[PDB]
Amino acid sequence: QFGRDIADTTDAVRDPQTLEILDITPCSFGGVSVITPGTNTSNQVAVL
Amino acid sequence: QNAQALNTLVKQLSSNFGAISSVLNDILSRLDPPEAEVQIDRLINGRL
Numbered sequence: 001q002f003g004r005d006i007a008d009t010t011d012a013v014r015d016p017q018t019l020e021i022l023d024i025t026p027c028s029f030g031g032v033s034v035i036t037p038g039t040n041t042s043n044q045v046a047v048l
Numbered sequence: 049q050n051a052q053a054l055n056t057l058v059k060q061l062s063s064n065f066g067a068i069s070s071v072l073n074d075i076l077s078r079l080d081p082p083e084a085e086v087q088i089d090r091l092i093n094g095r096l
């Protein structure tokens with residue numbers, strides 16, 4: 001009723017009522033970086 | 049070597065380091081704050 005990864009992390013699960021296989025993907029995340037010049041020229045920034 | 053280092057770092061999460069369990073939710077839902085904080089501190093020290 002459960003699957004696991006090569007590092008033994010949960011990756012799938014059968015739905016307990018309708019026996020179908022549901023893949024599990026961790027929620028999206030990531031670092032936030034800002035591109036900016038010397039402030040002696042402007043005050044605009046871009047976010048990546 | 050890089051893959052093995054990352055594998056060891058990932059596998060280190062399952063240890064309890066002498067605490068009650070390796071899951072924060074179990075400690076929160078099983079013990080009172082005054083010693084749950086001690087268990088959490090133990091886990092924090094190990095992971096650090």
Ligand SMILES: *[C@@H]1O[C@H](CO)[C@@H](O)[C@H](O)[C@H]1NC(C)=O
Nearest residue numbers: 036037038039040041042043
């Ligand atoms: C940028 O402007 C500041 C004024 O607040 C000045 O002190 C600094 O020397 C300037 N930098 C350059 C590279 O001109």
